[PDB]
Write a sequence for this structure.
């Protein structure tokens, strides 16, 4: 099936029947245990939501394409409140060239190591067969309300042999998601007075995509396959007024409807695959080079994450990420039947960011050990990793899987991530699964870097009103999490009923600090001798909830599917505030009718529970008025169909959000001077939207 405890498959056929506008987050987020959330609780860049597994935040969600990491978002400045002005890393592969998506949550994902603390999303592409095939896929949606941005998408694939031992596969995508109108949130905004009167919290940023991938497979012997692939992708946005704090200036307005960030992503990969008697082998080299070109922003207080009109123009941040991986897999025959996997991994992240490191110390006064001007643009970390998984058959139908991962991070030091995964047949229809693993999170190159320096005159300083600096800290420990999960599943004649409890005990979550470690010397007026905070390790945090799935065959042609997320707890145990903001629950419900041999029909309902904002502001003081606002439970219904015209041509058509339930970003979560908070009202939910699709394939 598509749902075991801790794991979900999305198939090409699923993607086809619930087409995404553009980004895959749309369909990935409907898996149990998965939300579409910001990383922390500020609501900053709140229309830029990314995949979150079990409320661990999206920085703890590792995105792979065919087993190879995507790290491109690590090229976007990481801000004071743990958000990047990034659309995430699930929009690099076009929907219609995906074979399947694998989502691995909690203890079963730790084995993947750095940044799999929430879990892994592996986006798997269609490959060549024994013959040549190819496809041409087009999708086009049509919002009821014009304010909301429509999406258009055209991709092709082409795959097959060249020789007896030479296979290839190529695809290309062109797509565009129009931005929401600059004024979509007008009349819904938080109360804005004085200087900030007239300001608006923005709708969804638009994106233009260009994706080209080529792969050559070379199986130069019976037991030896060698793969070369290159990826060229380009996302340029369509700006619609978004700023960190929802303030505006003149440069912002000048740029409405213009490209203000472009990401170029280049991937080259060498992969050798072995199969012989003793067992299996895999090793790969990926070089990911990301260029993040965007308009200079300020790094101080209310000027953090607005276009800086004193330093107008684009800079380019450059991420060179290098990944090499080796695994062999061994069948073994002993007192217990088993399979042993042995592996090394090596990664290098070089970040050149010529803008992030430029906050100067004149106003707050200077910081011993930090040069106020011409600090290095450069950050880097290498992790070396060794691991062995043992997949032990005790008695047929029962598997015990212990694995040890050891990682050497060249700054933070040594990590030991042990794991144990049990699956037990209690019956031929019932399976119990238990798992406890310690997953691993390396500090990001922003958190780690003593040259990375933000400033506030007070409004963003914890436990005071005075000026303060926030500073990078190479003294940081890595974040570790003991992800526990206990689950049970009945599966028989496509009847599936399962429920999982998960608890992740979260140690040394990295976060803007609560106590000054120091005070600077000198600078201007009341702002002089500002307090110094660094990126700190929070001792303890907890997430806890329930994943459920229930699939009933109503009739032979008719299938009723349901996935449930219920979030019990999400607590920073130091401040007692929430980590993420997620709906209390999420129920996704599909009815799938095979109405003919040729016609298939789909009704879907998604129910979102209550959403509560953070209780405390940047000061650590309790928020008041509209900063407390919660979002009521709501549902989104949709109908669709796919009418097969020939083995060569299929048409799709449907309506997302049938009953036109809409939500509007009112701003960030808390109040600032002149800008009331918006609590949980931090994102735009789009209204009724018609769509059509056409897929031609040999
Ligand atoms: Fe300020």
């Amino acid at each position: 099936t598509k749902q075991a405890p801790g794991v979900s498959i999305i198939t090409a056929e699923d993607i086809a029947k619930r087409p995404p506008s553009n980004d895959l987050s749309q369909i990935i987020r409907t898996m149990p245990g998965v939300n579409l959330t910001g990383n922390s609780s500020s609501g900053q860049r709140g229309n830029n939501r990314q995949i979150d597994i079990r409320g661990m935040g999206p920085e703890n969600t590792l995105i792979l394409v065919d087993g190879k990491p995507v790290s491109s978002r690590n090229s976007v400045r990481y801000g004071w409140r743990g958000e990047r002005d990034s659309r995430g890393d699930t929009n690099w592969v076009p929907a219609d060239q995906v074979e399947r998506i694998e989502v691995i949550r909690g203890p079963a994902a730790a084995r993947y190591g750095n940044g799999a603390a929430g879990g892994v999303v592996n986006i798997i592409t269609k490959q060549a067969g024994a013959e040549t095939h190819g496809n041409l896929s087009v999708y086009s949606n049509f919002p009821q309300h014009k304010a909301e941005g429509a999406s258009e998408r055209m991709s092709f694939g082409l795959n097959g042999p060249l020789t007896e031992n030479l296979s290839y596969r190529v695809y290309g995508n062109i797509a565009k998601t129009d931005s929401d109108d600059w004024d979509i949130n007008a009349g819904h905004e938080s109360n804005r007075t004085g200087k900030q009167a007239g300001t608006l919290p923005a709708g969804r940023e638009g994106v233009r995509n260009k994706d080209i991938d080529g792969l050559l497979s070379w199986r130069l012997t019976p037991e030896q396959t060698l793969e070369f692939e290159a990826g060229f992708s380009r996302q340029g946005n369509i700006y619609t007024g978004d700023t960190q704090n929802t303030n505006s200036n003149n440069y912002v307005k000048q740029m409405l409807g213009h490209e203000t960030n472009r990401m170029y992503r280049e991937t080259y990969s060498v992969t050798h695959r072995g199969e012989w008697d003793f067992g299996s082998s895999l090793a790969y080299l990926q070089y990911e080079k990301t260029r993040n070109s965007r308009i200079n922003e300020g790094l101080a207080g209310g000027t953090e994450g607005i276009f800086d009109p004193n330093n107008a123009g684009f800079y380019t941040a450059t991420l060179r990420d290098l990944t090499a991986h080796g695994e062999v897999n061994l069948p073994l025959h002993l007192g217990y039947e088993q399979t042993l996997t042995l592996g090394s991994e090596w990664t290098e992240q070089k970040l050149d960011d010529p803008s992030s490191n430029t906050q100067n110390t004149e106003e707050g006064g200077s910081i011993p050990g930090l040069a106020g001007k011409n600090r290095s643009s450069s950050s880097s970390a290498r992790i070396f990793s060794l691991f062995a998984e043992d997949n032990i058959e005790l008695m047929p139908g029962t598997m015990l899987t212990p694995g040890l991962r050891w990682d050497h991070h060249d700054i933070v030091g040594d990590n030991w991530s042990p794991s144990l995964n049990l699956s037990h047949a209690l019956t031929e229809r019932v399976t119990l699964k238990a798992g406890i693993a310690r997953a691993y999170k390396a500090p990001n190159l922003y958190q780690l870097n003593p040259d990375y320096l933000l400033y506030s005159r007070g409004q963003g300083c914890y436990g005071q009103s005075t000026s303060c600096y926030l500073r990078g800290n190479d003294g940081l420990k890595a974040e570790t999490s003991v992800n526990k999960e206990l689950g049970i599943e009945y599966s028989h004649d496509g009847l599936v009923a399962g429920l999982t409890y998960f608890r992740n005990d979260y140690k040394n979550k990295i976060e803007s600090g609560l106590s000054p470690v120091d005070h600077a010397s000198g600078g201007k007026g009341d702002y002089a001798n500002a307090a110094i905070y660094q990126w700190e390790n929070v001792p303890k945090a907890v997430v806890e909830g329930l994943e459920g799935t229930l699939t009933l065959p109503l009739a032979d042609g008719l299938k009723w599917s349901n996935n449930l997320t219920y979030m019990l707890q999400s607590k920073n145990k130091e401040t007692g505030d929430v980590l993420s903001v997620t709906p209390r629950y999420t129920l996704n419900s599909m009815l799938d009718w095979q109405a003919t041999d040729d016609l298939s029909l789909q009704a879907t309902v998604t129910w979102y529970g209550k959403q509560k904002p953070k209780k405390y502001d940047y000061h650590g003081d309790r928020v008041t008025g509209s900063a407390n606002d919660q979002l009521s439970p709501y549902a989104i219904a949709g109908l669709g169909g796919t009418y097969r015209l020939s083995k060569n041509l299929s048409l799709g058509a449907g309506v997302d959000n049938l009953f036109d339930k809409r939500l509007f970003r009112a701003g960030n979560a808390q109040g600032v001077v002149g800008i009331d908070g918006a609590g949980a009202a931090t994102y735009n939910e789009p209204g009724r939207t018609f769509y059509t699709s056409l897929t031609a394939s040999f």
Notes: DSSP finds three helices and 33 strands in the chain. The radius of gyration is 25 Å. The longest helix spans residues 12-17.
